[PDB]
């Protein structure tokens, strides 16, 4: 399993190519704030959303604490999608600089 720390993923915000981050937490959780521009695809809906992924990009998978996300990484790699677990999830990322939608 490919893994990245939150520090290393943040560092990618400094790069020109945008990184694809997928937040696989429940809607209840993501409603409290998520990483700007993250795709919000709760884990239990991931098998209904294979179309959101393409075989050309790397997908960084984040959950509350890095456990559900590892399962999604496995699921995605079994479907030919290049996915990387975000170690420590949102616990490590923190609650600062997050987005919530008003509409």
Q: How many Å is the Cα radius of gyration of the chain?
A: 13
**How far is residue 43's CA from residue 45's CA, in Å, rounded to a whole number?**
5
**How far is residue 96's CA from residue 57's CA, in Å, rounded to a whole number?**
27
| Cα–Cα separations (whole angstroms), residue 5 to 38, 57, 85, 87 | 16, 19, 9, 5
How many Cα atoms are found within 13 Å in the side-chain-facing hemisphere of 77? 13
Which residue has tokens 């695809």? 41
**How far is residue 3's CA from residue 13's CA, in Å, rounded to a whole number?**
17
Which residue has tokens 């997050």? 98
Element spanning 82, H or E: strand 82-86
- Which domain does 66 fall in, by range? 2-103
| Ranges assigned E (strand) in 1-103 | 3-4, 20-23, 39-40, 58-62, 82-86
Catalytic pick among 61, 63, 72, 83: 63
CATH number of the domain within which 78 lies? 3.40.250.10
**How far is residue 85's CA from residue 72's CA, in Å, rounded to a whole number?**
9
Which residue has tokens 């919000």? 40
Asked if residue 43 lies in contact with residue 72, where contact means CB atoms within 8 angstroms, the answer is: yes
Other beta carbons within 10 angstroms of residue 85's beta carbon come to 22
Beta-bridge partner residues of 20: 59
Question: Any catalytic annotation for residue 63?
Answer: yes
What CA dihedral angle connects 60, 102, 51 and 91, to 10 degrees?
A: 20
Structural domain total, the chain: 1
List the resolution, Å: 2.0
Cα dihedral 74, 65, 36, 46 sign: positive
Asked if residue 98 lies in contact with residue 34, where contact means CB atoms within 8 angstroms, the answer is: yes
Element spanning 4, H or E: strand 3-4
């Amino acid at each position: 399993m490919k893994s990245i720390t939150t520090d290393e993923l943040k560092n990618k915000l400094l790069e020109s190519k945008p990184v694809q981050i997928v937040d696989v937490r429940t809607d209840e959780e993501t409603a409290m704030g998520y990483i700007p521009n993250a795709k919000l695809i709760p884990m239990d809906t991931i098998p209904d959303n294979l179309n959101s992924f393409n075989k050309n990009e790397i997908y960084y998978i984040v959950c509350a604490g890095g456990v559900r996300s590892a399962k999604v990484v496995e699921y995605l790699e079994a479907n030919g999608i290049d996915a990387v677990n975000v170690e420590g999830g949102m616990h490590a990322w923190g609650d600062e600089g997050l987005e919530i939608k008003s509409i």
